[PDB]
Symmetry: D3
Subunit: 256 residues, 6 copies
């Protein structure tokens, strides 16, 4: 098998290409494989808001692996041990929630790097990350292949946006509009004009730093708007929402 690491999502991101994504919220490897057959550019395996254990995350990575869609993992928290677990199973692209300060962003980067650069403990050689040693010189290869995306979800995070963007090792900053809306005092109302203005300016600021700007837009009109504003890793739906809507729409043909 190939002895080299590669991260296509990261390569595309670095070129500024637009990558269209889908949230995977069922925890199941069965649905992850089905979703992978659609050919989204990326699939966010949501370990934060769906009840995934580390084994469920593993199984969803195995399920999607032969397909073109690239997986991104979100752990329940960006702590050292939880980042350890997902890196060791070979997740190459992480979305880390609740990054509010540059110091927190530096600590997240440190958790992903072996000495001398970070504090990551060895073990990926006997794990999926190095394919049990088939990836040769993993320590030498690993940093360039890891893609780190952080969520800015608070008033505090936005205050520190430029400092966070200056943190070496951060590749992209993601805004989830419903989290930010709640933090700003507009819970469940991300369409509010005040929230929309903050989103628009923030995207331009992120791109100006030479970093990628990410978003989750469950409404297609909002997705198109964020793309126009310069977002380039954009999730355009949540799979369980698309499922329920599709089930409802089919049923409605026979009850109405």
């Amino acid at each position: 098998m190939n002895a080299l690491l590669s991260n296509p999502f990261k390569e595309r991101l670095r070129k500024g290409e637009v990558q269209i994504g889908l949230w995977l919220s069922s925890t199941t490897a069965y649905m992850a494989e089905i979703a992978a057959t659609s050919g989204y550019d990326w699939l966010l395996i949501d370990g934060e808001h769906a009840p995934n254990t580390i084994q469920d995350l593993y199984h969803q990575l195995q399920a999607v692996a032969p397909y073109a869609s690239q997986p991104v993992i979100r752990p329940v928290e960006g702590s050292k041990p939880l980042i350890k677990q997902v890196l060791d199973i070979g997740a190459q692209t992480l979305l880390i929630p609740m990054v509010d300060t540059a110091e927190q962003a530096r600590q997240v980067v440190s958790a992903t790097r072996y000495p001398p650069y970070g504090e990551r403990g060895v073990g990926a050689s006997v794990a999926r990350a190095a394919r049990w040693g088939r990836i040769e010189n993993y320590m030498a290869q690993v940093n360039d292949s890891l893609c780190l995306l952080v969520q800015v979800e608070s008033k505090t995070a936005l205050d520190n946006l430029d400092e966070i963007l200056d943190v070496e090792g951060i590749d992209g900053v993601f805004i989830g509009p419903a989290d930010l809306s709640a933090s700003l005092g507009y819970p469940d109302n991300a369409g509010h004009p005040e929230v929309q203005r903050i989103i628009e300016t923030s995207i331009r600021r992120i791109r100006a730093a030479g970093k990628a700007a990410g978003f989750l837009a469950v409404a297609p009109d909002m997705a198109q708007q964020c793309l126009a504003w310069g977002a380039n890793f954009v999730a355009v739906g949540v799979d369980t929402m698309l499922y329920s809507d599709a089930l409802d729409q089919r049923l409605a043909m026979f009850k109405s």
Copy 2:
């Protein structure tokens, strides 16, 4: 808890009511619960063409239990031991595949009834079927609350349709049009005009014999047609098909 068995699907069937259903093809309890929130009249848990073990079937029954949509279980085949397993976990409505002769139909009914009338093995009192003894006088109550549906899939089954319809203990006869079309020498994609009258005639004969007539129509136009013919337990979609199509439709808004 309630000490009585009930079977709302069976009660509605007996009244000749139309019941609209959805195939559950993922094996997962997670998706079964989500599907149950839609309010289909019935959900077909497909143990024949999806890789369900008996524990997956058990978990899907647990997931859907508090919701209004009624579960129907299809085992991998209608053998005595496989019917035993699904009856003991408390599946009260069965869809039995590949019933080709009246003798097979009689054997299926026998597999659902306790001795001395049938051949069902005794043991419900220590299983979910009798809720571990909370259902009082289970053996006296059970036949009235069990609903048995059989599939006609082949030329042979069509030849024997009248004789099958004369078998006591069968509540409904289901036609999967793709099954019958293949038997008649026509593949899956694009339904086939040549076999439509055979299908319509068969549906009308089932109803004329006083049994419920079932169908799976993944195309809404065909579902409306089979309903007009008199089919009254009609599955109008497969959840994994609705899922994939919805994912494709959402992605197409962002691609070319």
Copy 3:
């Protein structure tokens, strides 16, 4: 399905009613369902001292859902991310261990409330908590249907009992007598007369502050005593203890 949240356990607690409970310590959905057929008022799904993952907790909630007994979830600890996980799967009543100070109690309440009032991460609409969007206006409904119970386990917690009882958003305070006895320097087997007044006084103080008082009393004599003192969410057994004792009792009839 019903678009409203409800929390019968919380409603009964608010009315001062006595609710009799059972600890579920096996991790298994199979046994949780069997236990639910007994008609305890509540079932404590023990995520702290039994080896439950978040998926085991999910499956136990699915198993008990159609029955009358109400589930209470205890996470491994009351951290922000672990509380997030159990809230998103739709656990509406939490028992939080090791609450030693009023500051800790405030942080626990904050972990259960959305910004800007709290720190709960947003995402219920794509999770079981809001039934994948079927619960309309979840964020408006949620606080009234969430019930928060905290454990006093230590000397420090006792010292801080009055201050904890003044924390808004706590509905009840639970005492595990074995926890407190150990903190006070007394082991598990045979309860200890020396600490009984401390326990009784504490129970009475909780009720006098207008909060519900909880207890686990595995000995029926002690359960009756704590009820007389005013405890009103009282667990009267641990299911694995009742199981082992019943197995032993049956075997003893045949041995010597």
Copy 4:
């Protein structure tokens, strides 16, 4: 580790010792281990009337293995392939349901024996049965260590009792009173005097052949009676029944 097979249940049976047993009906390895700590002589892992897959059976064998209680496995049916599966995982004592004729009993024995004596296919060398080769000369050792118990549950089976008892390789015959009662036309009424007379005579006949006589008696009075009549592998309860009764009895102290 030890290179020799041993079957303590079989050794005790051959000496005519009375072995007291418990049915395990939850499918769970968690409860199987708890049950094993009681010290029943045997534990019947019920693959027939509880929804066990072959992996659940495996896990329950692993759970009980360090304890003194000896496991007995009942498969869903005594077919060649299902007997293959449970022998390969190292089940040394089988309870085979629905054995109605001597020919069926011979076929069951054949399914358990390698050539020249039976038709069992090789593979146990790379399976748990031979502990992955740590049991040396497995083929030479295996027959003496395998204990086969067959259920007589029909009028037909009782008719053929002496012929079944003459089948080489059958070590014991088990009567389940509720199955036999139903077959005789006394469903749910095994206490009926006619059923009791047949049970008593059958036990004596089994013992007269130098074979062990087995029974499941959920009522202690009936268990003591069958022991008096000469039954020597006697299951005295079902674990889920003892669980539910224990839960009910504890609750009743607080509702009455």
Copy 5:
């Protein structure tokens, strides 16, 4: 994704190429993925002599999918329903045990082919076999990509070898030497020459009939000999045996 089905194992088989394989006997997807990184030409997922459920088979297919090594599935037996299950999950190459007659071989082929020519149940369109509909015209493409291998492992089967080789749809014939030796009267009391002659002549006959010849040789010398004789799908070890031997050899460096 690609709308054509391909079976690289079958393509190589048709080109007469030698394919070196490994048996996978642990049931685990974790180990299957590790094994796939070694670069065997094929991996036999043993559903007959290891305790695999259909879900374990599904997970092992998902695990190995992105790697070059091609999976071959052996079901518990070659029955209609069990073949149905494994074909629907997308196992394109099957090894069927215990094929003793040409009539049995024709029935196995029939179980793999759609009506009207066979008896395979319709439904792979909403399953992994057709990748949930991404494989267009699945019924038209399928026979060309399905590879059917049968085990001739008894004295009866060898007697019927020419008849079996002439069955349309049989792509290869496998000889498992331990079973054959046992059936020929040499269970493992070594009388080898008769068995070696039979293996050699059988392999040469299979090849002379233009079909692939298969073998499992855990001793490298025997594997080399069968290769020299013309076998072209040869499994050269069992993974759990290689694992135990490697663990033993490492420990021996430190012990006695």
Copy 6:
């Protein structure tokens, strides 16, 4: 069953005996049981660098229980709640990663000891640790049977080694050479002599302080050297590495 807790690993450790171990990195109970048949003195179930949930750890303990090899559990990190979980399931010997200071070491010890002397949460009586109450006086017996091993693996930790060795409750100190080499400034650009000197002096210091010294050496020559230096809990391979190497070596006999 026996009412006394015993920890053979700790007994041998206290008697200064050399114990040869193997890392278990697959998460699977299937492979754990196979490994246990080899007769290593200890098996390290790696919950830190393999994706084990607490249930996977539980199942691996159940799998290895009847064998002589003693399990050692490494949790994801040595936090209070994570140590609580693994102690309650009956892991009597822990390996704790990333212990860098004496204060950290005292906190780890505290997490393992009951109030009033430590902070371990009460509840092991209804858990596997006390075998559901079969172990009498568990709180009195427990400290003598718990074995605590800590990893000193950073430049900080080695600086604090004498302080850590003096912490009451620490039974052994483990050195993982790859992590230490990285932290000392030699990630795997070979500068070895400094590292070899540090390993040797550290092992000798640990032993001179009357504590056990541990190491993981995947190269047999290095294992032999650490043994010669006085290490007395030495792991001599990682099972998934031995597996991959054995698979590669077998394939190489047939390929290039």
